[PDB]
Amino acid sequence: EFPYLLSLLG
Amino acid sequence: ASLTEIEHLVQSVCKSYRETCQLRLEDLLRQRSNIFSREEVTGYQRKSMWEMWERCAHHLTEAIQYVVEFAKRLSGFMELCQNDQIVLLKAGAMEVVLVRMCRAYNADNRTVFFEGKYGGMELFRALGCSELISSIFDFSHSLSALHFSEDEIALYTALVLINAHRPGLQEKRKVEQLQYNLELAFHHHLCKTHRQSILAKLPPKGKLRSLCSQHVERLQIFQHLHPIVVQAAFPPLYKELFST
Ligand SMILES: CCN1C(=O)COc2cc(N(CC(F)(F)F)S(=O)(=O)c3ccc(C)c(C)c3)ccc21
Ligand SMILES: [Cl-]
Ligand SMILES: [Cl-]
Ligand SMILES: [Cl-]
Ligand SMILES: [Cl-]
Ligand SMILES: [Cl-]
Ligand SMILES: [Cl-]
Ligand SMILES: [Cl-]
Ligand SMILES: [Cl-]
């Protein structure tokens, strides 16, 4: 559900 | 974890914080004497709810970005699984910003640093969430009384984030161990600096919880009043973290 949070983790 | 590993963890956490603290304490202190004039205050109070919400969402999003960086630099965080990283950040990023806020709070005159100058809570009138604003200021006032050092806020915010009691965690034992080692680090640091007495005085949990819950509720109210503004102007991350 949290792709924009996930992106910054990469 | 050995005493050497715990000592190194204190240093690691303090460095991660130093690198992501986003505003220097020295700069914030120096700018206390920069206070909004009456006309400037009036200007903010006359702003539309939309514009003031939009501004605050931008600034909050910026702060949250530094907290994500803090997390990524935090010993052991990138070892957790994707799901757990997300769960801890979704619950904890806002809590960390709220703690970080006490640096930008001046208890003498009860002002906060906002868009380059200090103002009181009257500055935020157009937001239309009086209870939330007062609660934020109360929270800052209560932290100011602890007089945290930079090192203390680094260790304490690490602990706000690494919280193994957040719902939806997969690798709870993994998060428990991280939390425990961070407690060891916090306690070691406080013992060394003769500050262990502050532990018993920390904001109860549920205090941070309530502030975050209120933020979510007020956003829902705003979004129902002005749904176009959120989809048009707010950062996508902010929507993802705080919308329904
Ligand atoms: C309105 C929703 N809200 C909260 O519920 C949680 O507290 C907040 C903080 C911030 N800040 C984010 C940053 F300070 F971290 F940068 S601020 O735009 O400089 C600011 C500073 C101070 C106040 C009183 C307000 C209202 C704003 C933004 C939004 C919220
Ligand atoms: Cl206002
Ligand atoms: Cl924005
Ligand atoms: Cl968390
Ligand atoms: Cl200050
Ligand atoms: Cl605060
Ligand atoms: Cl302080
Ligand atoms: Cl932090
Ligand atoms: Cl002590």
Numbering used by the authors:
A (entry chain C): 4 to 13
B (entry chain A): 265 to 508
What does the paper say about this structure?
Retinoid-related orphan receptor gamma (RORγ) is a transcription factor belonging to a sub-family of nuclear receptors that includes two closely related members RORα and RORβ.
BIO592 bound in a collapsed conformational state in the LBS of RORγ with the xylene ring positioned at the bottom of the pocket making hydrophobic interactions with Val376, Phe378, Phe388 and Phe401, with the ethyl-benzoxazinone ring making several hydrophobic interactions with Trp317, Leu324, Met358, Leu391, Ile 400 and His479.
